[PDB]
Amino acid sequence: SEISRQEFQRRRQALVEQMQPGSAALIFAAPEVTRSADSEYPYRQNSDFWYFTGFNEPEAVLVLIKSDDTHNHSVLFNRVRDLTAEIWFGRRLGQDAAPEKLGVDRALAFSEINQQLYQLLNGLDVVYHAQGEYAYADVIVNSALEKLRKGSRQNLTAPATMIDWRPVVHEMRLFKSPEEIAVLRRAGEITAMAHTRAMEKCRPGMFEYHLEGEIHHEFNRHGARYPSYNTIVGSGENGCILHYTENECEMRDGDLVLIDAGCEYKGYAGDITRTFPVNGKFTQAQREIYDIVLESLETSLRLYRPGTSILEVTGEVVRIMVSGLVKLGILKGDVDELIAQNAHRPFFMHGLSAWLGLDVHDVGVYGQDRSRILEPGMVLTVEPGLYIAPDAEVPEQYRGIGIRIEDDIVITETGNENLTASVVKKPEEIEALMVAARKQ
Amino acid sequence: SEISRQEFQRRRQALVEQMQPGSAALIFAAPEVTRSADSEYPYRQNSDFWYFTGFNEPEAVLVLIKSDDTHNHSVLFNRVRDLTAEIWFGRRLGQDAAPEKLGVDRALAFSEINQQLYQLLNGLDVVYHAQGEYAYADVIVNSALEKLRKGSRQNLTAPATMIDWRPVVHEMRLFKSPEEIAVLRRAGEITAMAHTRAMEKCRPGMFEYHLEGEIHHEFNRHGARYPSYNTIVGSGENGCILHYTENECEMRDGDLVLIDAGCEYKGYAGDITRTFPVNGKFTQAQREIYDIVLESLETSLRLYRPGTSILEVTGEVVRIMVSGLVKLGILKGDVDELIAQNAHRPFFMHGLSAWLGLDVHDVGVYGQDRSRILEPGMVLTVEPGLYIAPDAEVPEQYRGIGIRIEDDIVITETGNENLTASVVKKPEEIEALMVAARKQ
Amino acid sequence: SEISRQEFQRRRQALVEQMQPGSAALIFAAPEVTRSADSEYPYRQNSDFWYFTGFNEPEAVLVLIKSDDTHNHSVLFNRVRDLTAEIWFGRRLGQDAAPEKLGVDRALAFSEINQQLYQLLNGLDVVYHAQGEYAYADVIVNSALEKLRKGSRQNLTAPATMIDWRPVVHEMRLFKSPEEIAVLRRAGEITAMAHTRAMEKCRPGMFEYHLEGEIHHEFNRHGARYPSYNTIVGSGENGCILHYTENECEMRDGDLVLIDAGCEYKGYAGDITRTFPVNGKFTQAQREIYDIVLESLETSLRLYRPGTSILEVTGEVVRIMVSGLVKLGILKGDVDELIAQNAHRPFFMHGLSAWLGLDVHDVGVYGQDRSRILEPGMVLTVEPGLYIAPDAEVPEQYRGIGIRIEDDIVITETGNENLTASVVKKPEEIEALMVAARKQ
Amino acid sequence: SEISRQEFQRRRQALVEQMQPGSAALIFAAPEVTRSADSEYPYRQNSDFWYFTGFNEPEAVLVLIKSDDTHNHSVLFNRVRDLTAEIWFGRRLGQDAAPEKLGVDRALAFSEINQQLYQLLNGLDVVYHAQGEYAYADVIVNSALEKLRKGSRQNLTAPATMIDWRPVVHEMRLFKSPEEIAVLRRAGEITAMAHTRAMEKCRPGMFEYHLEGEIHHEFNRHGARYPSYNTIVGSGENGCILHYTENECEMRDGDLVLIDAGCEYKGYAGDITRTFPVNGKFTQAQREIYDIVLESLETSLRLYRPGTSILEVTGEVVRIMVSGLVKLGILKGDVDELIAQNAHRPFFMHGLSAWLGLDVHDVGVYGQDRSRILEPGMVLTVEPGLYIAPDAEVPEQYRGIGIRIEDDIVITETGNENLTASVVKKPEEIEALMVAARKQ
Ligand SMILES: [Cl-]
Ligand SMILES: [Cl-]
Ligand SMILES: [Cl-]
Ligand SMILES: [Cl-]
Ligand SMILES: [Mn+2]
Ligand SMILES: [Mn+2]
Ligand SMILES: [Mn+2]
Ligand SMILES: [Mn+2]
């Protein structure tokens, strides 16, 4: 499953449908990024630019021109064919092949953008530009507008209105096509296989980074070369650090390990967290915390559907957490009073759900306190956790326990579809999986 | 093998020894780098900052103050301890632990750098600063100097002299300590194991990226989490593209695959290229080109020693290449005339050797045409190649063949030590290795 | 005659009337400008900021908020009262006195603009901002919008639409109120008195700058402290340089002097050019060129009215010029063919008319080739000239003659009113004025 | 009196004498400065650039190259000859005429600076650059150095050392040549004539700006077109504001007027303050304050000589002031205790003396608290004042009195020479001058 030229074209058209007549939208590629000295990081295209192109080169700009309500066309600026640069650094699409390959009407050399962009904007009423997204892009846009403003003697005129297209595009991205959902389903499966593998490989004495290695190898073998974010492998007290990515410690017999990892597959992210015993067996204390987090996730998965909200479901989770913590003596008092005091916050300090798509923590408006009403096509994580610090004023057996369990779901007409349920999370199933692996 | 606190301190002292009395050297950490939206790439410390600290955090500045020829001290600016930021994003060294951990005299909060830096520079004659290395660093330095220049009424004075420390530091980095060489030896071994693994795993029908996966997994298992540069897996015609990193193609029965990959181990790079048949057996045409490249490497490895140069050894390689290409009918004419015409350049278009250390294409002055006389402690690659384009005007059987073979060496008192010879390169040894693997 | 608080308020209201509901307009003051080291040039307020305020301080921002179609209000950011800064550098309006003095609803300290501006823009749909007018302003606006864009968790929202208010404001400025015209009339009178004075003072052997001195003194005595542009005193060959401002030469018996000078009176510009003989008597050659330029001006003054255009009147001037130049042997051939060839351009190379107001070369759309139809309330210069270079291929007696004659007019219901006719321009009147002065 | 080509050359040579062998000094012209829209302020050359050139154009750079201790040469970058630009905006020196006119060895087009500057710096050890003086200059220098740093394959090398030449040049400027002193003497005379004129013209009912007009006209007539700083005409309570430049008030019968004004003559500044009664007669209260300020100035003029300091002389002035204020009941207590408490500071809040030259508040090191030992050739102001605020807690008759009296002096072998004593300052002489003028 991937995204086709025809879909990128439909997206461009859907944006054009929302634009004023006499306007142009400018969408810029990500710059290349230095790792050290003359070496660059592996290229990651800007998500919005990707969304409208599927084109994985820097020094590229998509220009959508809406002349009026019937006439529109597209111009791509992109790197020219150059034998020498290509022998050295790789093949370039170039101008001749781009229109057919990408489905754009015209292609021009990026090297000519300053000579050409102002000509495309001349006489328009509106320019759609994500101001402040990239410095290099702002420079190009501001220079073109300045030429037009200052060019009255050459009969040039600048569009006086600049609109940030990010709100409109981010609303588009918030609602996935069936094809996007198919890609996300595969990302979920790949990510799940990686997590299963980490559970099956984990042994006391291995380093946290060894599990990262197993995960990244599994991503790669299914064609997801890169993770969607830096893999977290937090064992023991490291599990209480939310974005722990050092992954430098030896994993101890008797500790839990929390793994938060996701692949990037054809542009789309998986995002799974599983927490499990390093030695294959939850202690009683570990199991007691684990059960609360799992009940939180399982209830959330029953509830998520069109017409509810992240906020509403979060309320249910908070009650489950407070109730469970009171039962274990971690919190003390009346459950309703404790809920009213947000007494769970020292142990569950983050949100339950984030949008998912081309990015983790994907784009799109949440509403105040994530109160936006859910509709079919929205894709989100469900990630309850409890983190009991090593020095927390709680019964000693719970100190240093960090547990999160996270699935990715898509809202459907009738509820939700869980994209990541093919990696186990019930404690007895985790133990059985690890017992079986440990016998080999 | 790694680098100790005591060694980082010796390096700081060696720099101070070269500084004028009444001076300060300012060494800035790398900024964090966005991958997409709110996700950052895995952090890579600035190599020069690393060289003097072994400290892997952003928002840090090392200040070496040489008050006079006997008195000097060090101040580190680094991120403060912060419970919340650390629960979220990871542990920070902070100010209390830094002096003992890093061996610096004093540590201050990075948040205070603008309030404190000018006070450290006040009254000095010279500031050593790598101007233009980082924008954020230039802003900090320029602001401090401006405060001093403008502060005569507060009895402040700016150092009038600014010296770029990069030439001095890069000369330091060019000559490796025994401890650095030990780390580089391990990087070489790890990188070699990865290349051996790629040869043993390669089969027709696998994707180029599968070999990348095997390599990165092997790096990781030995504790080299990250590659030192983006892995190149160029099969068939892709092998003729020097920095081919797409790695997207299905590897064909009958093609060669060129793999250029290296790990980063405790800050130090491996850098190995091996080229081998996807199906385990060189064709005659492939073998004929391979032999020339191998003879080039083997001769280079015999020759490299103190008192010669990259330029001198390159001359020997050029003769081997021209002679071999004439013998195969790829070049036509008199060898000496062809050498005089640089007739090899269409097929061997890059340098034979690059410095190696904390970076691939490491720092240090090469001399005109890489004519600098080699001395013990220098570390370099040896990377002859021949690339015959698909459309080259040569006997048809050679078209689309890209071969490079690269080892990493250290110049010793008596010659050189090859750090990467534990992965095979003789064609009969490559074939035997692959035959053995293919029987499993 | 000046502009009152009530008029500045009417202007603000007229802008608000044109704004979308749920919007804010941001109008920034000019920065102070260094002349040398710690000395600044005399402050000149930004014309658009002045137009809406009559407020002559830097570090000030006018914010017009249109909450909806009935509710709107104004906020001024301006420098705080500060005893010490004021003892040193002058009085400041401050926040307490500003609402009554300027007629704005609220005033806040400029020092608080970054803490307050985003709060004013939060939740609005549209921001009107002259992007690129001033760097310091762009920084403030971009920072506020970035806070809002990034502030969804604090329930902040940025206006997605940014509109350049310059086209709307410049159209406002193009049409003068009766009060503006009264100020411009006085500027014209003051400027005329200065030019009369220069003619009455001019003698052979005086320096060009002496006439500048007389002019500036005359401006000052009527309360126009500053010129509206750098005074031009171009005698002999210097008269052939359009913006000659060196004014460094000794004025020679037998040469013409061209004086282009205008005052700034209560914000509004005069702009007059007169050319006259240094010795009080036109030579025959000088008179022959002068007559053509004068006929051009006199015809233009008869013609300018509502419903014609600068382009149309320019056509009449071009015919007068070509006809006259043919008559003198400066041009050769058929007048209509020469007109068709724009054969006048070597001698008359600039436009006939420019808008006049708060600036010379005032704001407002001219139309292609200055073809915009004139309407009552427009104010413009009328400035024909002929410049015969010292090396021009023309009868020798004309070489080195530069003549321009310029009046300022306002278009009225029935024609135009000449604001600068109180300084003579008929050659016999110039001679009589100078003869009378030279007898004293 | 002016400065000759030969002197500019001696200055360049004196700088070169202080430079390291294998170095270049870069001195940049001031940018042109916008007043409003398309109109620029009258051009003021950068004082340091002027000091080495006497060249009054923007877009110019002086490059002094010291190849070694015997060989050096100069290159000027400056605007090219261009017929059209010159017809419009004025004559340009160009490249052909510059070497002879300015005494530089070579001249190149400013438009070529980026193509040429790096070539001039290539291989040098040291670049002298005033970093942060101008943004446009920093851009040019940083770009050239970056080309060199990055150009090792083209055998380019950047100078690693950058030295701010401002301290050395400012020390040069601090000591005036006899020719500079002659120019300063003329500036003093011109400025004095202007102040005499203001006293002779002043009448009750005139505006403060009228006196500015008289002053500027007097500057102009002697060939000092521009003031060296914005003229201050502070009558009544406005005299208590140190840099009062509004000059907007009607001068009242019974008030004092303080005039601080100076011309710029051939690059060099005058700087005179006189305070006098608007109606020609000091009141008793006015005279009582005036006498203290005058005694302060007269004592300072007796004392200033080589081997004393501004600090030492200031001590004498403070005692005179405290003693006088105690005598009038403005201060109360023991003089020595009051001196120890700096009890004069509410009434005399600024320094006694500032360096004078190409700038007011001229360049050069003062020492802590202006303690530097004076030597022949130094030029400075002497400017005691007393300012009694309208609301000061003092005998009512003194409130709202602002008096400053300022002369310009040059330190000589035997004492000082007063450059501005040709405008009167003894109260009886002021009254006699004004009485005589008021009878006309
Ligand atoms: Cl291109
Ligand atoms: Cl910090
Ligand atoms: Cl303020
Ligand atoms: Cl030029
Ligand atoms: Mn996650
Ligand atoms: Mn390599
Ligand atoms: Mn004019
Ligand atoms: Mn003064």
Side-chain angles (χ1 to χ4, degrees), chain B residues 301 304 378-380 382 407-411 416-419:
Chain B
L301 293 168
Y304 273 131
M378 291 176 170
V379 186
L380 58 153
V382 189
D407 278 334
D408 309 327
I409 71 174
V410 57
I411 305 300
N416 72 81
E417 177 188 350
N418 191 334
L419 303 181

Side-chain angles (χ1 to χ4, degrees), chain A residues 52-339:
Chain A
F52 292 110
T53 67
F55 181 50
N56 201 40
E57 296 185 27
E59 295 197 314
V61 190
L62 178 65
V63 181
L64 304 183
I65 299 158
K66 183 174 189 173
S67 296
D68 64 48
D69 293 299
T70 65
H71 302 307
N72 67 85
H73 80 278
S74 57
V75 183
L76 176 74
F77 291 87
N78 64 315
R79 290 160 156 189
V80 70
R81 299 314 299 274
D82 182 84
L83 183 52
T84 304
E86 291 183 59
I87 289 159
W88 281 80
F89 303 118
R91 299 190 183 83
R92 295 165 168 201
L93 182 54
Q95 280 75 62
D96 295 313
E100 178 63 17
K101 176 65 168 155
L102 300 181
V104 299
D105 299 306
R106 289 211 310 149
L108 300 173
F110 181 82
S111 70
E112 297 317 308
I113 194 166
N114 293 316
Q115 289 69 42
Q116 298 293 329
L117 178 56
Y118 81 93
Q119 305 195 58
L120 297 172
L121 300 177
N122 177 34
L124 298 184
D125 297 328
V126 179
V127 60
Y128 297 80
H129 171 56
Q131 183 148 275
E133 186 73 27
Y134 299 118
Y136 92 93
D138 292 348
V139 170
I140 289 167
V141 176
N142 295 338
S143 291
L145 295 173
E146 280 298 303
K147 273 167 181 165
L148 295 173
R149 285 165 197 159
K150 297 175 173 143
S152 67
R153 292 167 192 75
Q154 292 70 49
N155 304 317
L156 302 173
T157 61
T161 300
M162 178 177 290
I163 303 177
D164 187 358
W165 48 251
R166 284 167 300 192
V168 155
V169 170
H170 295 175
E171 182 71 12
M172 291 171 69
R173 284 180 52 192
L174 179 61
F175 289 88
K176 277 61 171 172
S177 71
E179 286 61 50
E180 290 182 289
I181 292 160
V183 182
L184 282 155
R185 194 176 284 119
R186 185 58 183 156
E189 292 176 5
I190 291 170
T191 298
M193 286 187 282
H195 279 262
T196 296
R197 176 175 172 176
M199 283 182 295
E200 292 184 326
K201 294 295 179 72
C202 184
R203 305 284 188 282
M206 285 172 45
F207 284 83
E208 290 164 333
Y209 64 78
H210 285 136
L211 298 191
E212 169 180 336
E214 295 298 311
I215 290 169
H216 293 171
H217 183 273
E218 192 69 16
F219 294 172
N220 173 282
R221 71 183 202 91
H222 300 295
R225 286 171 81 197
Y226 306 113
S228 51
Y229 52 91
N230 300 326
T231 298
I232 294 156
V233 186
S235 74
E237 298 181 9
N238 299 333
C240 302
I241 296 169
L242 294 182
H243 298 84
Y244 176 78
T245 60
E246 283 73 18
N247 300 354
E248 68 192 2
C249 300
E250 188 182 325
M251 296 185 293
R252 305 311 186 171
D253 189 339
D255 285 358
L256 299 178
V257 59
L258 182 159
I259 299 185
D260 193 340
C263 74
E264 200 170 85
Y265 179 71
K266 306 291 194 204
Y268 291 82
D271 186 356
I272 291 179
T273 310
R274 291 291 185 269
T275 306
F276 54 95
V278 171
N279 66 16
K281 178 72 209 185
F282 287 94
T283 66
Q284 185 182 338
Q286 288 165 356
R287 180 62 181 266
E288 286 165 347
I289 303 304
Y290 193 85
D291 285 348
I292 298 164
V293 183
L294 184 59
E295 185 177 334
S296 295
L297 177 53
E298 292 182 340
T299 296
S300 293
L301 293 168
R302 284 193 296 276
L303 294 176
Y304 273 131
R305 65 195 187 276
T308 195
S309 68
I310 291 165
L311 181 55
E312 185 159 43
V313 176
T314 296
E316 283 278 280
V317 169
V318 166
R319 177 172 291 280
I320 289 165
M321 282 172 177
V322 174
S323 298
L325 293 174
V326 167
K327 190 176 137 297
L328 302 177
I330 290 162
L331 291 180
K332 312 200 184 304
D334 177 76
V335 166
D336 286 333
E337 290 174 27
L338 288 165
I339 289 168

Side-chain angles (χ1 to χ4, degrees), chain D residues 229 232 260-261 270-273 360-361 381 383 404 406 408:
Chain D
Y229 52 91
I232 294 156
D260 193 340
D271 186 356
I272 291 179
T273 310
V360 296
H361 296 170
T381 67
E383 53 185 303
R404 171 166 72 258
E406 167 179 35
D408 309 327

